[PDB]
């Protein structure tokens, strides 16, 4: 049994976003719209329900840990359910949670060489935190093969590179390298059950679709409904392809890509505050449900039972 | 009229703290104890109720902004009630909130030279954030005299140095300099009303007590009830004087110091998860109330009306 807990399902500045009065965010604050609050994206994995591996540490990590009881097993005066942390990139959105875990160092942190480089220079989390009882102990993620974290010995991680787009603070932001962005294949080796996790997904080649058909659950990038959704909402000009996020709709969007996967469970995660699929009455939400695609929400539990 | 809004009243890792099962934190989670959740310490100041100055940007800033309606005035598609940020030190606990405000740059940030130095080297917030549309625009806090932030032209800030203890990541952590830690005197120049704000207070000389008697409201360090409260709770060994926090109780504690101030409104803020004053039934809470001292809580509004 593989447990997947959605601690956060939003992109970005969460939902609602602190400085945003778009139709979704103002509608949620006004109470005029049927949608649920969401913290920034992060999931937790386990093979036994007691030892958990965090994927990305969002700035909302304090409220996310508190909302999920297994994160506090209460086995000592100081304790946590977090046994390791995996990072998929070095973005601020996906890493600042680590600053809120220093009362509990050391932590095993798994990340590639590129991300480790960002996190010792432009955003030197590893350097800052080594001053708290050992800080973060780096475990390198190699760009080929697999790894296993002792705390969950039945989970086999197989990362796959995505389109390198290093963060704006990165010393190598103009010089993208493989290792900047990862998606994760996760296998319960007791059952063959396979999770495909890609919350940041900019494009889909055919090596990727081959991975995805060997998987039972697809937990994928859903930040934007339209590639120019920021412009459509009046909140900015950056495009989906500029951010490395493939929109749901249109030619080559994730919904059309996902029509090739009727076997798999399909879940959209990492959803931006502008996306109409957050409006539970939107026609965009209704179409997503027609296509057999779920919309992740804070608190969602996904149990991976067996292989199809 | 000076408005003081308590966005967060806790020290530390908030209350409850993510990894703590002390009597307070487990008691709150178990539902066995009468206490209210608290985010990490931060207040917001205003002279008109519309333009707000943030004092310290805690890691909980997203939930704190959302909980206080004037932080979203909804005057445009992107908007915020934050018009400036003042930092009293460079600690991670009091600054990581800035990483969650990058969708809204530029921000005017006021801080001393020492803190600016920390925030461009050991924890380079200013460098990281300058990649988001101008980032943080530094306004130096001088170690003498006063300053005024245009957005609240009737608030006069007069900082006073406290015992220099630079943070553990600081390149100068073993070499403390004046400018590392500030307390704030805040004056409504229309009325003479004066707030004395010192959430981190390690000792009390007589220059300080002279400041405090010219003030109407004392909003002061309340993190620890006893100097060795960590040891008494089983959660660690660092002492109150090691952290630069003067306990409430005992010879020279803040309660004995505050007996000399019966005129002033007195509020304890920045309270650690271990402190029994969070237990609303504790005898420590009852004594605090007897002495005419209030316990700050998330959401507390303090209106400074006039000068005594
Ligand atoms: N610091 C950058 C931020 S880019 C980014 C932007 C958005 C859109 C944003 N929420 C909005 O509505 O104004 C959503 C995201 O998920 C992002 O990641 C990085 O991530 O490198
Ligand atoms: N990163 C350091 C952290 S020291 C600090 C420690 C505590 C005690 C802590 N909460 C606990 O119960 O385990 C409370 C605080 O308010 C602190 O500031 C800094 O602040 O320089
Ligand atoms: Cl980033
Ligand atoms: Cl610190
Ligand atoms: Zn994100
Ligand atoms: Zn919005
Ligand atoms: Zn603090
Ligand atoms: Zn506690």
Coordinates of C-alpha atoms and ligand atoms in Angstrom, one line a residue, chain A residues 78, chain B residues 15 17 20-22 24-25 273-274, ligand 8:
Chain A
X78 CA 10.0 16.4 20.3
Chain B
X15 CA 1.7 27.6 18.9
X17 CA 4.9 24.1 17.3
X20 CA 6.5 19.7 19.9
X21 CA 4.5 17.5 22.3
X22 CA 5.0 19.6 25.4
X24 CA 0.8 23.1 26.0
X25 CA 1.1 21.8 22.5
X273 CA 4.7 27.3 22.9
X274 CA 6.1 26.2 26.3
Ligands
LIG8 ZN1 5.2 22.9 22.8

